[PDB]
């Protein structure tokens, strides 16, 4: 169903793997945030990988969305990880210290290994 | 009154000039945001300068607060400006493209000149 699948994802072993295939920025940030909350977080799915392989850059609005997800998941005691940030994105994650407060993995298999234990 | 003045500010000609004298980051971000909304934005003060002279660095949480203020002010048709970011802060503002969507001034007199016209 289209709205259920407004952005690409799959659920593997109670983990929601989000795979946006386009830029996450001011134009789509609120739409994406509302979708993650409505489809997953507000329905009790609080283990989420945000896969960034196809995200060219992030801006302050996409960072605000990441922060909002992180806050929700930290509050409920779930698991949040950023996966495969490119170099431009990783530079932003570093300079804003987000890499000190959220797990970041190079690959999905690495993230899966952590969430299992 | 202490809670009214939980952080340093002054109101000059219908402009709220916020002058945090310490770091704005994950530890104080929500407290600061709630204070700006409760004291100013929710009371109809939508012309705000966030003066950054004494803010050593910003993180993803303080950026999220800036974004939330910006969103509120853009929605209500007010005026928002960042004033006197240091080099570390300006690098974050640049790399996250915030400098493309919010006015940034070196000094308070420059900002005042814009808000007048
Ligand atoms: Cl949003
Ligand atoms: Cl928005
Ligand atoms: Cl929402
Ligand atoms: Cl907040
Ligand atoms: Cl918070
Ligand atoms: Cl608030």
Curated annotation (Swiss-Prot), chains A, B:
Post-translational modification: Phosphorylated on a serine residue.
Pfam families for this protein: STAS
Keyword entries, A-Z: Phosphoprotein
Modified residues (Phosphoserine): 60
Domain STAS intervals: 6-115
Gene Ontology MF: a single term: anti-sigma factor antagonist activity
Highest taxon, organism lineage: Bacteria
UniProt similarity note: Belongs to the anti-sigma-factor antagonist family.
Its job: In the phosphorylated form it could act as an anti-anti-sigma factor that counteracts an anti-sigma factor and thus releases a sigma factor from inhibition.
Name of the protein this chain belongs to: Putative anti-sigma factor antagonist TM_1081
Organism (species): Thermotoga maritima (strain ATCC 43589 / DSM 3109 / JCM 10099 / NBRC 100826 / MSB8)
UniProt lineage: Bacteria, Thermotogati, Thermotogota, Thermotogae, Thermotogales
């Amino acid at each position: 169903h289209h709205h259920h699948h407004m952005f690409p994802y799959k659920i593997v072993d109670d983990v929601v793997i989000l795979m946006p295939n386009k830029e996450l920025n001011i134009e789509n940030a609120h739409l994406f945030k509302k979708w993650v909350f409505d489809e997953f977080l507000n329905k009790g799915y609080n283990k989420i990988f945000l896969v960034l392989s196809d995200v060219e850059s992030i801006d302050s609005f996409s960072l605000g969305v990441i922060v909002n997800i992180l806050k929700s998941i930290s509050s409920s005691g779930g698991f949040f990880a950023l996966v495969s940030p490119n170099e431009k994105v990783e530079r932003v994650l570093s300079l804003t210290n987000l890499d000190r407060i959220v797990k970041i993995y190079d690959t999905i298999s690495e993230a899966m290994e952590e969430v299992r234990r």
